[PDB]
Design a protein around this ligand. Sequence first.
Ligand SMILES: COc1cccc(-c2cccc(C(=O)O)c2)c1
Length: 242
Amino acid sequence: EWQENKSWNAHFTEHKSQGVVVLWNENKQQGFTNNLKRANQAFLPASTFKIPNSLIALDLGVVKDEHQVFKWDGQTRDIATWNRDHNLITAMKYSVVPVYQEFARQIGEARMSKMLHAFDYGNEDISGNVDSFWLDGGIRISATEQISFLRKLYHNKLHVSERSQRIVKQAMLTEANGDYIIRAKTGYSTRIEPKIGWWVGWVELDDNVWFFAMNMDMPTSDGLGLRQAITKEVLKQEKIIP
Ligand SMILES: COc1cccc(-c2cccc(C(=O)O)c2)c1
């Protein structure tokens, strides 16, 4: 079942922005959101696509393991952390597009398309350039569709090896303390309107897991921090985290 909680709209209209948060209680199998319509509106996945992209690269052998080094191609880009060597862990952490563009080129159109259908990922449409379709191509995914994909990953139910899924979930590690663990991936879509930010993942507790998927309008990069801050405010309000 689902439940709409418009009280959460304050967290967006307090920072003069608009967006949706979708929560899923795995134990109770119940969903919650501030906006049922936007929860089912499909956007470019942008860097959240590095989750499925990593899974495919690992399962096809394009990426041997999370230690394999992908050397900087020597082209200076405006993101300083991109102008250096990376492995899967750091490429995820710093959302290093050029590393994942190379993954996609080595994956190829046919295998990429085959895998996204097996994953039931979004509209499963890779139309556009194989090395940028998740930034300015035809692929689209909604917040509720992100949840369904993430739940499969959590339970090792995606049609790739258990090893591939374990490695990606390691690479998704974002925060951990004595109270909770967050595995998640940010996204920032700018090439097609509306410009949005993503944060998708889940919160591990001692005895339950809460999946989440949020997106919000992002007219400029100044508000990127609100992706995590708004999500955590919702989690705090629902007393999912202290
Ligand atoms: C043109 O590329 C841009 C433009 C503006 C920002 C980024 C960027 C890079 C790394 C992390 C993140 C992030 O979501 O925190 C954002 C990339």
